[PDB]
Amino acid sequence: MYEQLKGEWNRKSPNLSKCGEELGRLKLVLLELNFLPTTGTKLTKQQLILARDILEIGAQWSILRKDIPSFERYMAQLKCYYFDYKEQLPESAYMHQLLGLNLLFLLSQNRVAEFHTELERLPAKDIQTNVYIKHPVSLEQYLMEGSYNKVFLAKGNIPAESYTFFIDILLDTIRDEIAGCIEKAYEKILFTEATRILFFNTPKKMTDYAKKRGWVLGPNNYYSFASQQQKPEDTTIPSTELAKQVIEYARQ
Amino acid sequence: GIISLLDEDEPQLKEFALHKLNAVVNDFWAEISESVDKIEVLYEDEGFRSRQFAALVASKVFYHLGAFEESLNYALGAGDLFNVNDNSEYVETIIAKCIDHYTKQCVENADLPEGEKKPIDQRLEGIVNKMFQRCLDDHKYKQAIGIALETRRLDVFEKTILESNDVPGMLAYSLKLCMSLMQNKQFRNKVLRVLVKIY
Amino acid sequence: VRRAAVESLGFILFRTPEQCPSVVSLLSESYNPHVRYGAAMALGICCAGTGNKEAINLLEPMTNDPVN
Amino acid sequence: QYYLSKIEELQLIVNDKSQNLRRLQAQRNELNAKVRL
């Protein structure tokens, strides 16, 4: 109970042996009474404080160790614990930055409903101040309006908590998005076209592009394959829906 | 989301997360309605000592979903925790569905009683027996016979007249029910054989 | 078969004398006079000594039907 | 007596539907009698 709150987690915690200490922390201190009521009991208020502190520590450890299951579990625990907003407690500090990182990676998971509903929970936290949390908002805004390379340069800096790996995971989502955008109705894709202008100057990305998806490389050029056809139409599903109408007003 | 606390490989963490689900069941619906996957994981994790009450809150999840029959089945698989409380409206709904299921199964297994019966679940028979027994022992025999006849048990009328015969006109009341109301002889034979053996 | 099947229904449905006039709202008025005749006879059979008050009211128009 | 009430409501739905079904049959029958006349 109330043991080594941040005894070894503040300076540096790179070892894997700290997982056992965290597990013991969960068994003893995190499971003291509850996190739900938070009516009075400033002791439980400090229990919520240490719960949020160990959650952010786990978030930093997970984003540095690249473990999707553990990271997602810490994200959901962070959301459920923060579900209890108490205004008298000192907000900010840990709030805006972590929420920005969580939302940014959630957009890398392709979820926008949670992003915007959190933005509505934060009327002035996102627009008036806290570059810590509007950095993902600006990145999404640019990545929706007009920018690919400008997004990359914008991603070059994270003001929230450094930890410049959410920019790389968004870079992995935009290589997928760019690959889809060029698998779209484009007319032709030169090899230098795919390699130079957008990103990925002759990395293993180039081999991934040349081997995974279609549009086989011609002479220094990928070309669109058979996707638009005259389609001499057998016209059988129009017959089925016609029969569906027939049976619909063949009765009652 | 609290589902992570159940997603951790710590049984104590799972238990802590799943205590208060039966208390937040009334207020929170959407978060519990979307968490069907998590409770399925807990139900599959039968090596954890809270399998029974995890199936209970699984039935609570299906209460949120609206699948009362599936929630009945989950609390059925839990077994002894089907009958945690005997007085609630969700309890009345699930017992009414289970009585309907028992009535249908009894009718079909009496119409084809030469073996090969659909397996009368020990867990379902146990809760059914408990429910109409207490409905007989509540000492309201103007409705105890009525719910008994709805339950459609072959021996239930015999049990009702062998127990405390409150309002001894219930004999004539069930007499006119079997004379006029129950007339489809194929499943009427249970009420008829009890009626002839007593009268 | 039409006249028969609209007259020999009160034998089964006299257990529901209130439903004798309900199941004949179209039979007693049908374009087939034999169907109307059967409907009439069906209510008469199913209500032997009952003051139904509804079969009588529905049979009153048929007491003066143009078909003999 | 609650399943009683549910069966009665289903009874009411059937009766309400059967009203216009009977009436539609009667009036179409009258139409066929008129054209035969």
Binding site: - | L149, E150 | - | I7, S18, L21
Partner: peptide, 25 residues
């Protein structure tokens, strides 16, 4: 009492609805 009374009444009315509906065609 009223239980099977309305059960039988439902069975008969639900039947006569469909049967008289059979004449719409």
């Amino acid at each position: 009492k009223l239980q099977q009374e309305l059960e039988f009444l439902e069975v008969q009315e639900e039947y006569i609805k469909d049967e008289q509906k059979n004449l719409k065609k």
